[PDB]
Amino acid sequence: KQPMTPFEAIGGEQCIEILVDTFYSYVSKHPDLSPIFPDDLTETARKQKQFLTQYLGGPNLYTEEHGHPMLRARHLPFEITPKRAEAWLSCMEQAMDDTGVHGHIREFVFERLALTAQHMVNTPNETGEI
Amino acid sequence: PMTPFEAIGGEQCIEILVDTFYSYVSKHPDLSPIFPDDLTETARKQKQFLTQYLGGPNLYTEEHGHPMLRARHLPFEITPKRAEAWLSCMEQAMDDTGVHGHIREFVFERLALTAQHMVNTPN
Ligand code: HEM
Ligand code: HEM
Ligand SMILES: [C-]#N
Numbered sequence: 322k323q324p325m326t327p328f329e330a331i332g333g334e335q336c337i338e339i340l341v342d343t344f345y346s347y348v349s350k351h352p353d354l355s356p357i358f359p360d361d362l363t364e365t366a367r368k369q370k371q372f373l374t375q376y377l378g379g380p381n382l383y384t385e386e387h388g389h390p391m392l393r394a395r396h397l398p399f400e401i402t403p404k405r406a407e408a409w410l411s412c413m414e415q416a417m418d419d420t421g422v423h424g425h426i427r428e429f430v431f432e433r434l435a436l437t438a439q440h441m442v443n444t445p446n447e448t449g450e451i
Numbered sequence: 452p453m454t455p456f457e458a459i460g461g462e463q464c465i466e467i468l469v470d471t472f473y474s475y476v477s478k479h480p481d482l483s484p485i486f487p488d489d490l491t492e493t494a495r496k497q498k499q500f501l502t503q504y505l506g507g508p509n510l511y512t513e514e515h516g517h518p519m520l521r522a523r524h525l526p527f528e529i530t531p532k533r534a535e536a537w538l539s540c541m542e543q544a545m546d547d548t549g550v551h552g553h554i555r556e557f558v559f560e561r562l563a564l565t566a567q568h569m570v571n572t573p574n
């Protein structure tokens with residue numbers, strides 16, 4: 322009896338569509354994030370839906386088109402501070418709230434994302450964070 | 452190919468691409484003054500950075516630590532005009548090394564976004 326994939330567990334394609342569209346809504350309004358993103362977030366949102374789908378055990382949509390994610394490498398030119406990693410996760414938390422993602426699948430997905438976001442950090446903190 | 456680094460032609464292509472690029476930089480009046488007179492060490496690091504960025508070996512971070520790319524560019528007066536000059540030199544370098552098609556558009560669009568992020572001084 323097949324357990325559901327995390328992708329299935331979270332609600333599948335329909336949930337990822339709404340989560341990511343909602344997510345980048347928060348990103349576009351966040352002062353710590355919006356400046357480093359492209360002005361139009363459409364292509365970014367499209368790509369993120371492909372990534373999260375495959376990331377959660379759905380079809381390999383991202384790799385099929387774009388090749389290996391190698392996300393840390395792809396984020397190297399961008400100023401990703403621990404502060405911005407925190408803003409990213411904050412927006413995702415709010416998107417998950419808005420999209421009704423809860424329980425064990427929420428904790429599963431959020432904890433993976435938190436680990437990934439930490440991996441992306443490539444610039445040290447501002448004064449105060451020691 | 453599974454990585455941009457492979458797709459673009461790998462190490463040999465990055466070599467000629469970056470060597471060519473800094474030839475154009477050295478001749479560009481909007482850029483040459485803020486670069487070192489000798490661009491050897493700069494070209495070396497850029498080959499490391501582009502290699503790792505496009506999915507090759509982690510040459511850059513292994514030697515130099517975290518990228519913190521914008522921070523490394525803060526001490527230089529990088530205007531939008533200079534970002535344009537930078538991208539113009541890269542365009543020519545790509546033409547000269549035969550980088551075309553989708554891999555060209557892929558890499559150039561990412562470099563253009565990056566160059567915009569480096570800007571730290573108004574025109
Ligand atoms: C930690 C804070 C992060 C910041 C500040 C950040 C910022 C950015 C920016 C500015 C881009 C460029 C958008 C584009 O070129 O289309 C990007 C691309 C991308 N990021 Fe993030 N990112 C972060 C973390 C993450 C995380 C946790 C994930 C996990 C899903 C992720 C997945 C992606 C993907 C799939 C792309 C598209 C790359 C491509 O194929 O061109 N990023 N990121
Ligand atoms: C937007 C216009 C840009 C200007 C005017 C500019 C200018 C400079 C200058 C003057 C240096 C110092 C060179 C040295 O001290 O050896 C430097 C370093 C560097 N730049 Fe740029 N740059 C620009 C964009 C970029 C972009 C788009 C990239 C993408 C890879 C990049 C990657 C690097 C790297 C890897 C270094 C070496 C950092 C180190 O010392 O470890 N730069 N840049
Ligand atoms: C990355 N969003």
Ligand SMILES: [C-]#N
Binds near residue numbers: 497
């Ligand atoms: C910098 N080139």
